[PDB]
Symmetry: C3
Subunit: 256 residues, 3 copies
């Protein structure tokens, strides 16, 4: 048995949360299975892009609340939230783009995981909430990723009232990149995944890292940083292949 299942094919790794009976709860065990599937062979050139999806009608309900009862000890509580944050940080610092594919409810740390991904596609019936407050545990952790996804006015009404937002509201305020009918979720997600897998890994990997490095900077420093990265991109073989191909009106053949 294992709470995530993973499969990689034509550069696309799909990590499926596979405990629908437990509403794909981010138990310490599930988090570690997830961490493991994300890190596995992360620098292989054969890996181009990660999709994180879920089995069933709940993407994830968040943490296992039994693990956060008094008797488990504060050290164990610390471990749950730290392992979780470590995973969000792995995703952010990963060499490849990570995409959330959502087809139903993501709540609390489940909503955190969607928000932490580079891209997020959902079906129109999905919904997102941070309701820890209803069980006496403010979604503070989730609030980190939600604060960087949506406006404060949206985030604080989510966090203080525990009420969920629709997929269309998520799309409007920045939590998601795309929304489509359920029937098309897989075609739409694979459209983005395949496009990514069809590009140069080292160009896309430098693109991602650079983007998160410049993001918190002032404008001048953000531009020093990125300019210098364009110049480095140009010195890659795939950089010159890409330009040459364009100038010669033909398809680029990436070596990575």
């Amino acid at each position: 048995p294992r709470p995530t299942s993973a499969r990689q094919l034509d550069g696309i790794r799909n990590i499926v949360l596979s405990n629908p009976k437990k509403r794909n709860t981010l138990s310490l065990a599930m988090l570690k299975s997830l961490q493991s599937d994300i890190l596995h062979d992360a620098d292989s050139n054969d890996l181009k892009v990660i999709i994180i999806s879920a089995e069933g009608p709940v993407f994830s309900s968040g943490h296992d609340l039994k693990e956060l009862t008094e008797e488990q000890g504060r050290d164990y509580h610390a471990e749950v939230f730290q392992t979780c944050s470590k995973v969000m940080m792995h995703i952010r610092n990963h060499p490849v783009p990570v995409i959330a594919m959502v087809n139903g409810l993501a709540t609390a740390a489940g909503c955190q995981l969607v928000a932490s991904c580079d891209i997020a596609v959902a079906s129109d019936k999905s919904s997102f909430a941070t309701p820890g407050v209803n069980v006496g545990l403010f979604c503070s952790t989730p609030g980190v990723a939600l604060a960087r996804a949506v406006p404060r006015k949206v985030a604080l009404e989510m966090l203080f009232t525990g009420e969920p937002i629709s997929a269309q509201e998520a799309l409007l305020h920045g939590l998601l990149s795309k929304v489509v009918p359920e029937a098309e979720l897989q075609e739409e997600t694979m459209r983005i995944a395949r496009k990514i897998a069809s590009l140069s890994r080292p160009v896309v990997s430098l693109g991602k890292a650079t983007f998160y490095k410049q993001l918190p900077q002032d404008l001048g420093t953000a531009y020093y940083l990125t300019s210098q990265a364009m110049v480095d991109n140009l010195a890659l073989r795939d950089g010159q292949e890409g330009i040459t191909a364009f100038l010669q009106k033909r398809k680029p053949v990436w070596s990575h």
Copy 2:
């Protein structure tokens, strides 16, 4: 009597800007009255949430320009602005959440006050402007709040041109949490206020303070801050109550 009236029933403090004849101008006296009502008993457990509302069709027109003439002197000017900012800071840092209920025009510092609230619910007839430029006074202090509410491209047309946006546009760009027809403004606002009031104050309070602490950090620091906060929240009696109530399928009883 005073330019702000404050009542508190059942967790919910309603503070009304009650000077419609002067468009709820944020004169120094309006600001000190409001500060007073915000701060009063701020640590009392009977207070769970604050709603800031306004009497008349102008939520607030902003500062009183008569206070900003050359005759008052630069120190008076400094006091109006330092006092206005203190207030906004006191809301930011308040132990409980603060909600704006808006039924009309919020311009200049009045728009700033809307944007400084944690949650803001307006009627569909409402509008928001930063027209200081038109009276030679760039809306620099309102731009602080507006720059943290809306995209730059929206904030900057507002500030450079002084033209209002509608409540619809305000919702689309993040200045407001909710917009409803005016007939529904009070129930929509009380729906949120009551919800907040039915939760655990110390958990909501920890929640709000932590949120504002993590917001400006690098992501790693933000997770260090918040992970520790969660762990401390579990140590609260109401943390464990809410958890236990949930796993026993009942309503929780907060201390």
Copy 3:
């Protein structure tokens, strides 16, 4: 012979990207011409606002890939991107507001430029994209302005996949200020520019500089800085003229 044309009338400078046969590509020579038109007489009181527009159906395609080929050397490559970054910074640090008036496609460094302006107005047929990746050159430079324009989830789909967003979407997500038919575009941009031109230069210029200074700060620092700028504004002659004029129910006559 210059790849930009600039004309100034009633305080409004229009700088027009005028190399449509090369889709207004941001070559080193276009960037220097553009830089020159922006900086020229920048402290003159007769200048009140800048509009950057373009000839023809592409606004700009971004940099000239020729570049950018290995043979040009890294110094030349660093020059293209450093000059582009300086242009961006000159727009931000300018004493007057700069409006982008966009009518068609704006791509890579072209999109950068748009998202670098203080206000942007676009015809409804306009569209925006950061397709570097397709030519092995990630839009790292453009992702600076884009990260500060739209939500991460929108920016990162755009960067990793290279698909345009339309002007409606750039409006919703914060790329643009206004979207109007192509037939309202000149008048709509002129409404903003004339309004600005009708205000006090010193007051607007103070506000613009103050705005970008407070923008990164913690909230306490932001209010310290702005409230001190409020007080400085009131010590300006046009500060007092505007306030008096309001209180006397008349129209302010600015001195600047």
